């Protein structure tokens, strides 16, 4: 409100395609976590009920990180197998 307007969260559509530029802006906000925050902040969420969220999120992030790594590590051996029908 004290900041200069139109500098923030602004995309300018190129070659007149609107839908593309909107997708772009959406990708911005969702990349920064603002959509999850708006949606979060429609109602309240109590501090306890918040650390639960945090911890469940962070556990899940750890799991998915690890499992991802493991998958991409074992990726090589997806290759068609040499020894078949030994």
């Amino acid at each position: 409100a004290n900041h200069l307007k139109f500098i923030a969260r602004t995309v300018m559509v190129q070659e007149g395609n609107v839908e593309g530029a909107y997708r772009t802006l959406n990708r911005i906000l969702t990349m920064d976590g603002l959509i999850e925050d708006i949606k979060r902040r429609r109602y309240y969420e109590k501090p306890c009920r918040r650390r639960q969220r945090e911890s469940y999120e962070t556990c899940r992030r750890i799991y998915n990180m690890e499992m991802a790594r493991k998958i991409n590590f074992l990726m090589r051996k997806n290759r068609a197998d040499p020894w078949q029908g030994c």
Binding site: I62, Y63, E66, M67, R69, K70, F73, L74, R76, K77, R79, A80, D81, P82
Partner: protein, 99 residues
């Protein structure tokens, strides 16, 4: 008589030291269509993909140039006691036994 420790101290696998970015010589002992299984002699063979240049030149018995990345592929993962082995080593293909 040679003591084992002596055999160890003077071996090439020792002399090489750390595995990263080493320039190694290797041999192709098995082929599946795009994939060439290369024993450079270390413990485990590595795998490669036949390059676009001179495809038919790389055959079983052919000798090859390798840039050795890792002597073997291993890591420990979430809730694991022992780390996990691929039973291969990581290497890159440079040229074929440039002579």
């Amino acid at each position: 008589v040679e003591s084992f420790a002596s055999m160890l101290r003077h071996s090439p696998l020792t002399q090489m030291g750390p595995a990263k970015n080493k320039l190694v010589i290797g041999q192709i002992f098995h082929i599946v269509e795009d994939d060439l299984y290369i024993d450079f002699g270390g413990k485990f063979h590595c795998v490669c993909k036949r390059p676009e240049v001179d495809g038919e030149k790389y055959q079983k018995g052919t000798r090859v140039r390798l840039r050795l990345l890792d002597l073997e592929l291993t890591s420990r993962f979430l809730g694991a006691t022992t780390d996990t082995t691929i039973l291969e080593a990581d290497a890159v293909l440079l040229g074929l036994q440039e002579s």
